[PDB]
């Protein structure tokens, strides 16, 4: 149970490091792969730590993994099918925003001040903007930094539950 989850987590950082460091001329897909593997690492960490957060927070990671797999699939695609892929990713983004709103609603019920909630919104939006920057600025040293920042953000969310 916990032992195997730790074994994968100690193996998790042995893959993401390899993906990020290698293939210096990968492109916009390498950063997406690294972000997906960060989502897997986050899910593993949530499973190892307090497991009561799987529904509001682990589901966030799984749905982000689904969205970033859809984005990988429709990245190189170009044509008529792209309109049915973007609109589907739009429904995915709406649902991830709804899940984040639900998480904030259940956090607001646990005595969180308004400034803390605003800080969480700002941190999530900064994380999304930094991921977009990593998509545009395809340099590898920035993908590493944005993935570490995402891990720190989710670790802080876990710590402040």
**Nearer Cβ to its own copies, position 44 or 134?**
44
**Nearer Cβ to its own copies, position 69 or 149?**
69
Minimum CB–partner distance for residue 139 and its own copies (Å) = 16
**Nearer Cβ to its own copies, position 22 or 139?**
22
Minimum CB–partner distance for residue 126 and its own copies (Å) = 25
Would you state the structure tokens that stand for residue 153, as one six-digit string?
Answer: 């953000």
Return residues touching its own copies (CB under 8 A).
1, 4-5, 7-8, 11-12, 14-15, 18-19, 22-23, 26, 29-30, 33, 36-37, 40, 43-44, 47, 54-55, 59, 62-63, 65-66, 69-70, 72-74, 76-77, 79, 81, 84-85, 88, 91-92, 95, 99
Minimum CB–partner distance for residue 157 and its own copies (Å) = 17
Q: What is the 3-state secondary structure (H, E, C) of the chain?
A: CHHHHHHHHHHHHHHHHHHHHCCCCCCHHHHHHHHHHHHHHHHHHHHHCCHHHHHHHHHHHHHHHHHHHHHHHHHCCCCHHHHHHHHHHHHHHHHHHHHHHHHHHHHHCCCCCHHHHHHHHHHHHHHHHHHHHHHHCCCHHHHHHHHHHHHHHHHHHHHCC
Minimum CB–partner distance for residue 7 and its own copies (Å) = 7
Would you state the structure tokens that stand for residue 28, as one six-digit string?
Answer: 């916009």
């Amino acid at each position: 149970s916990i032992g195997l989850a730790l074994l994968l987590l100690l193996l998790a950082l042995l893959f993401w490091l390899y993906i990020v460091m290698s293939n210096w001329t990968g492109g916009a897909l390498l950063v997406l792969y690294s972000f997906a593997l960060m989502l897997i690492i986050i899910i593993l960490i949530i499973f190892i730590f307090r497991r009561d957060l799987l529904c509001p927070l682990g589901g966030l990671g799984l749905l982000l993994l689904m969205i970033t797999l859809l984005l990988i699939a429709l990245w190189n695609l170009h044509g008529q099918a792209l309109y049915l892929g973007i609109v589907l990713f739009i429904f995915g983004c709406l649902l991830v925003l709804g899940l984040w709103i639900y998480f904030l609603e259940i956090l607001w019920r646990l005595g969180a001040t308004i400034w803390q909630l605003l800080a969480f919104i700002l941190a999530f939006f900064l994380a999304i903007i930094l991921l977009i920057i990593a998509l545009y600025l395809q340099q590898n040293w920035w993908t590493l930094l944005v993935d570490l920042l995402w891990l720190l953000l989710f670790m802080a969310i876990l710590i402040w539950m």
